[PDB]
Amino acid sequence: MVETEPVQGCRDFPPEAMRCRRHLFDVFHATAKTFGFEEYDAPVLESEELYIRKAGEEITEQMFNFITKGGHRVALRPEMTPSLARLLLGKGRSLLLPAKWYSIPQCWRYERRREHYQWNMDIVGVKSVSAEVELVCAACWAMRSLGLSSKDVGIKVNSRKVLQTVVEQAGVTSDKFAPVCVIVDKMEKIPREEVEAQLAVLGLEPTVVDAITTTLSLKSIDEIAQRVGEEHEAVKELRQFFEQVEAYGYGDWVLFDASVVRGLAYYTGIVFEGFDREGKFRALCGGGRYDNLLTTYGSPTPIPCAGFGFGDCVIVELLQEKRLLPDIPHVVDDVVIPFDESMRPHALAVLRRLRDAGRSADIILDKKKVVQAFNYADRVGAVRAVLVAPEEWERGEVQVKMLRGFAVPLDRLV
């Protein structure tokens, strides 16, 4: 006997599990379409150089990389955003903006799960917070579509610009900002002593660290306004953002949280993450504005961007807890049953007709008695059994039985 288990930290999807995954992806696709996003894809295998950002980020640290036989430094993508950027740069001026692109890539890591699917939604070429508004509303829409309400989940929202200023006022070179965010993102995962220590090695004195901590604890936008001024870009932008989400009708889903910075180096403005309101699960989704990324890759002109990722594992756990993932059995409209093998040719012609009309239909493939054929029909969740028997056939008819009997002319089947 061979190894029946999948490779370590990778999931199989037999039909039952695949139906659950399809249920979820159908929502991702349908939400994208509802919101006017266009699908794209790129190779799971990308060049390693694409993820070397040197900011101590977790997803680049835990990158499932290797070397080809020809010596090229490649990686299974740990995220999609750099791929998106590559594609955008490749198009250059031929790309019409604004663009709204989405995908559902499998993404990888190595250290626990080594593999997940991550819905990515990104808006390209929009300077204003309307992009972040749309993105956050998309994420809410998807969760709404899976049966969740604003009682079950929320989206925490912040801007890194508040922190950008505090760092800049202390005198720390702007090069240190991305590392600072990556470290401060660790506040829940490790103790405050551990994070204070990490910022010390980065090269910031205790007074600068104190100001950082203080602003993360600020509980409202007014309290930000007091600290940095009402004219501060972050204040106007966050206000516009909440005003717009409120107007769209998702005010109950969103709130301000000054502790949210995200772990990625490249976010420059508004950032956000989804969470369950019971405090039981890790983040459901996460994203933000990243206006300089394409400039760092060498775009001759700055290109504003914003987007998010929405994983496939935490959401499912939440949905299972809330009892929103009942098994959906397999279904098919018709099961065609030859009375015996001599009727098979006739049964095949019926099967053809049924399928031609857009119905999903099986035919009993092996030899079996009608009662067993009917049992099989019930097992595959057939709505209807179509028995093709000799007496009825000579009258131009079949015998039909609803699952969930009597003669019917062949033309009236469809």
Add this chain to the structure above:
Amino acid sequence: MVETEPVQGCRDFPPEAMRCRRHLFDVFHATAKTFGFEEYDAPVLESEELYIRKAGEEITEQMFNFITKGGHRVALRPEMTPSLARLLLGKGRSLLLPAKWYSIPQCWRYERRREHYQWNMDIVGVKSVSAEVELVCAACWAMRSLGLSSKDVGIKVNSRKVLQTVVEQAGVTSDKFAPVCVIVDKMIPREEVEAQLAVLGLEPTVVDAITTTLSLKSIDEIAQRVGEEHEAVKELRQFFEQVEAYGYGDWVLFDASVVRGLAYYTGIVFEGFDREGKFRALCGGGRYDNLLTTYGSPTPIPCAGFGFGDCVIVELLQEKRLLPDIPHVVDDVVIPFDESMRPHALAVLRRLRDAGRSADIILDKKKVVQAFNYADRVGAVRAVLVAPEEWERGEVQVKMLRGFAVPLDRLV
């Protein structure tokens, strides 16, 4: 500037190319559903041990394998069938049979394209040729659905059992049969193939009989050589009788040269081809009744299926002009008259989406005429201008793309 091109032999799918791929996959999915197959998936990364069949097969020879940091021998799958088998074995007796499973995995190779998508359709637990009938009909259905007819394409059909007997009559141990098929599938010059069979260990007389039967042009001529009640004859006849009865007789034909390159096929094999002789095989498959036994199934489990790649079909469809660009479309584009109307425009956008419509809103600041140009560019069916005067009347202004006032409730 960073490298904008993808990794060697891998494809990008920006929206235009992705639409084409979606058009194709929608057919694969819709065909599977029409035929009652159930979707499954498995990891692109599988254990290397799963593909070491030692028969000199091309897809195992060209396998994109590597070693993890922890030293485990893994591979990016070159095909799906072994994964399927693993999954089937894992279920064991809890698997209800017959089962009809399908998937659309990306599969890999290393040597030219390193990567393709391959629709897989497999029927499990059906002894009889009805499985192969259904599978072949599924493949025809898919091509029909893409706009192809039996004038454009066909499916060549054969059984390896004919060749199995010829080999067995010559006295060659049954262990040599799979290698023989893998070599004969290469029909490189005849001199090169004759040579390969010689090293496998068959004498010239045994090689001659093989060659002869591959050149036989009809089932009757098979019947003459091996007898009318040889399993292959009865089975092929049943197969054509059933495909004929289903209504796809014009799509299928017999070809004794078709054996396929995979070690594990035991019975009927088939491959799709364009009737102009311009392209490589469109799809390929067959019965493989012993595979699950070789993996250690305590009971033999009959199987049959095929793979249907995503590259050749597209080339064929492009030649036949059956892949026009499908522009992106959206039902509505909501246009704020100016920024002060944005909150109102957002409420309208909400309502439109609530009713199942696809809708954009103009995100950045722009004049109405430019907003309308953008609406046309994204292929909007309708522009909904949200302007102050109309709003005070409980209305918006609507213009069809492909103007006048409308009450807000009548938009949807």
